[PDB]
Amino acid sequence: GSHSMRYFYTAMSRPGRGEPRFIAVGYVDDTQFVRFDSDAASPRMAPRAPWIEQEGPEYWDRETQISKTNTQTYRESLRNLRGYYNQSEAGSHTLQRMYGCDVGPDGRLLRGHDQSAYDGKDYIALNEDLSSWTAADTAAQITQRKWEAAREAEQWRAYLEGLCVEWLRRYLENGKETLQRADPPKTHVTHHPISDHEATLRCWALGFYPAEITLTWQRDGEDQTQDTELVETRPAGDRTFQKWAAVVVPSGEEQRYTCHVQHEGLPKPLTLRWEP
């Protein structure tokens, strides 16, 4: 039902190796659809999904210019941030920003987001009100003061409630055969003896989209959270995702264990067992 659009900016300094690299990537849900990289032979916002290719030159020109402007702004920002933390000119540092909008089945705004991090630590975030900020430390308070003075929150609210939702809706229509199609996991349980008295049961979910999924093991109907090995959801490379959950069980007790799968592509949760 619900959908999100997100942009991810990464600016990385690299003293002695040129000016900071700026990359911007845009997603609808788990589908990347645009990318800009300041290191490219010829930097421009470029399509990464077929449904965005139909946008005209005016579109690509706007996005390229914004991204070239950002390349410069984020460089100046990294210099400011180095100063705020009294850091050496010799070290490399990273500034990240993630922003965008969430909409429900009816296409209406659920909420907007704009958050930044410096060297992997939260730095400043636009609050859910789209009008005020939460600064992580005294450095970020300096940024907050600048942003307040520049009426940045007003600009973000206008974007998040306006263009963000409008264009997300347009993308969802233009890419409706994929963006609005949930592919359910293909599920199966494998069995791997460890010893004469224990075996691993591994419950697999393959070929699903979007990435969000829940895989849990129960023993006699009791959840096995602490005793489950759950790998991170990983991309297959064909838009879909994979995940598994494993539990070590006493030999001959395999039928007491059930794997439970929830995915938006499934009408009702699935229960599976090892089928020898």
């Binding site: 706007r62 942003w147 520049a150 206008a158």
Partner: peptide, 9 residues
């Protein structure tokens, strides 16, 4: 479509 350019940090 992209968000708005704005204040340096």
């Amino acid at each position: 479509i992209l968000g708005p350019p704005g204040s340096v940090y």
